Design a protein around this ligand. Structure first.
Ligand SMILES: CN(C)CCCCNC(=O)C[C@H](Cc1ccc(F)cc1)NC(=O)[C@@H](Cc1ccc(Cl)cc1Cl)NC(=O)[C@H](N)Cc1ccccc1C#N
Ligand SMILES: CN(C)CCCCNC(=O)C[C@H](Cc1ccc(F)cc1)NC(=O)[C@@H](Cc1ccc(Cl)cc1Cl)NC(=O)[C@H](N)Cc1ccccc1C#N
Lengths: 305, 305
């Protein structure tokens, strides 16, 4: 019993974090086999950041301009290249702790664990979701750039996020591990705005199923709704439209609890229209939307209370 | 910027988790040097659990009754002993991945990271606090017994919790790593009730300072209060009394934000008496009490917004 924001065990990723320094700029890199991946803005000085020409900046660099430290051990850089917004540094040593891994580019609404690092040293782990507007509501300070987001499946680490910057609103923007930003952002020091965010409806529904699985049922009702009528309510409360694909993805939770998806939608409709009246769900006084249906199945019992 | 429930990186503890089997009972153990620590109820059968005599049960066992698996590698048990509610199994192999570590018994209100494990395999990491009634609001299923709670300080792992059982209320009870339960609980299968819980006042105050550090100031006021008057309000709302020791512990956060502790108390008084009126603090619609002053300093910037 119980329900917590749960990250994946971080050990397989901790063995991959290194420090990358280029001049006065220091940040984190990810060391896999004999390649170190890091944000390309490590090659920028403070004046370059306003409108950098990265191709120009990189051509003026050589291998010896890049300091890579794994622990206190310095790694020799033997080659460098740029791929979109990530720098790739080839090193003379393959990382002996390289896990089985993949690079994946995730969709909005998916969650991942973040290993927050400073100066190549892991400092904490938490759960994030990719927001519909392609930002993440992270916890990051100066020096955290190059920290990665990941999921783990049977000892295979799926890297999906590399941290690049904090927006003026305090939310966070970054890239897949091939250097492509999530969302419309670019890696230069200009005030950039994300699109207006929305609530991840399918995740809220998954979290309501977690509450039922755990024995919280006060918010249920006898009402059912149609997909079209529910989505009218979703629009009104700035919720993402619920697709038939989302209904099918919630199938297993619907089957374990005996509550049809459209039945749970009517409960959510009632919660949106009337609030909670001082009650909590799974210890929260708001509707939580950073648990996917997969996250719920992963954490919750397979038998309903 | 941002603020998240943040666990310590779990890698140093992942390398210590093993599976311990005794008959049909399987749970997790902690392998440090050549000793495996696990809940002593692994030696109980289903009928023994009602009122076990552990000294009797252990005398009828020998080393070969205990199966220890680290990965797929079986570990040879060469000695066994009981210390309070933990079993200690001496094995022929020292764990090559043993971190620098200490055993610590924590006070209520302190937080720790939990590495939830099943069958010796880490499955997730989250943050917990020891509640004033000596339970933790964990996320644990059958098979999670022997999972540990820990803090990390400069590569030294401080183990403070070993998980033993879930109470009928769905909260969780366990021991320090010397086998002494937190709270009044005992390791037998009877319905046990915890004392009534209270809110950790000093942590709520720390979390309010985190909000100011991050730029959330709507809940501040010009009022100040006295320690005695505030504690009258604390009693009314089932909050722990605030001690002068707690005031002093919040000193560094008070100094970074320019908000005297008793000033923040008057803000908290107003929040308790009037609620939030539909506003959030650090993305929560409730007053959060599972961040210590240390947790806030660890995660937040050292300069106030
Ligand atoms: C309303 N309130 C509640 C919300 C409080 C919100 C206050 N938040 C800020 O003031 C952050 C600030 C906002 C901003 C201001 C002007 C501008 F023109 C662009 C952005 N952002 C940066 O300073 C960017 C500038 C930058 C550098 C390189 C590139 Cl490639 C791109 C960019 Cl944009 N630095 C970074 O992100 C570092 N790499 C990492 C870092 C440094 C410092 C702090 C955190 C982090 C992280 N994580
Ligand atoms: C109101 N609603 C919202 C809240 C929903 C609350 C429903 N929760 C329960 O029903 C759990 C149940 C409550 C209970 C019932 C009768 C009783 F007499 C004592 C306790 N507890 C156990 O079944 C105990 C029995 C036990 C075994 C050995 C010892 Cl030494 C001591 C004890 Cl007490 N088993 C365990 O804790 C396993 N080791 C781990 C485990 C097994 C199964 C599930 C979770 C975990 C964990 N983590």
């Amino acid at each position: 019993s119980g329900f917590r924001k749960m990250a994946f065990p971080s050990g397989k990723v901790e063995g991959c974090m290194v420090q990358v320094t280029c001049g006065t700029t220091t940040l984190n890199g990810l060391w896999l086999d004999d390649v170190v991946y890091c944000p390309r803005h490590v090659i920028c000085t403070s004046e370059d950041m306003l409108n950098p020409n990265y191709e120009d900046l990189l051509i003026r660099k050589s291998n010896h301009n890049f300091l890579v430290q794994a622990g206190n051990v310095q790694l020799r850089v033997i080659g460098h290249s740029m791929q979109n917004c990530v720098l790739k540094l080839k090193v003379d040593t393959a990382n002996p702790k390289t896990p089985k891994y993949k690079f994946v580019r995730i969709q909005p609404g998916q969650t991942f664990s973040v290993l927050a690092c400073y100066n190549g040293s892991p400092s904490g782990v938490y759960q994030c979701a990719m927001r519909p507007n392609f930002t993440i509501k992270g916890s990051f300070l100066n020096g955290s750039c190059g920290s990665v987001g990941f999921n783990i499946d049977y000892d295979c680490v799926s890297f999906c996020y590399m941290h690049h910057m904090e927006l003026p609103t305090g939310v966070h923007a970054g890239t897949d591990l091939e250097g492509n930003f999530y969302g419309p952002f670019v890696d230069r020091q200009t005030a950039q705005a994300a699109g207006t965010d929305t609530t991840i409806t399918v995740n809220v529904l998954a979290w309501l199923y977690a509450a039922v699985i755990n024995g919280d049922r006060w918010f249920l009702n006898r009402f059912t709704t149609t997909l079209n009528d529910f989505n009218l309510v979703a629009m009104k409360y700035n919720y993402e439209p619920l697709t038939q694909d989302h209904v099918d993805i919630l199938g297993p939770l619907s089957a374990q609890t005996g509550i049809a998806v459209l039945d749970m939608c009517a409960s959510l409709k009632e919660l949106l229209q009337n609030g909670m009246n001082g009650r909590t769900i799974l210890g929260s006084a708001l509707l939580e939307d950073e648990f996917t249906p997969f996250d719920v199945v992963r954490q919750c019992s397979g038998v309903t209370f």
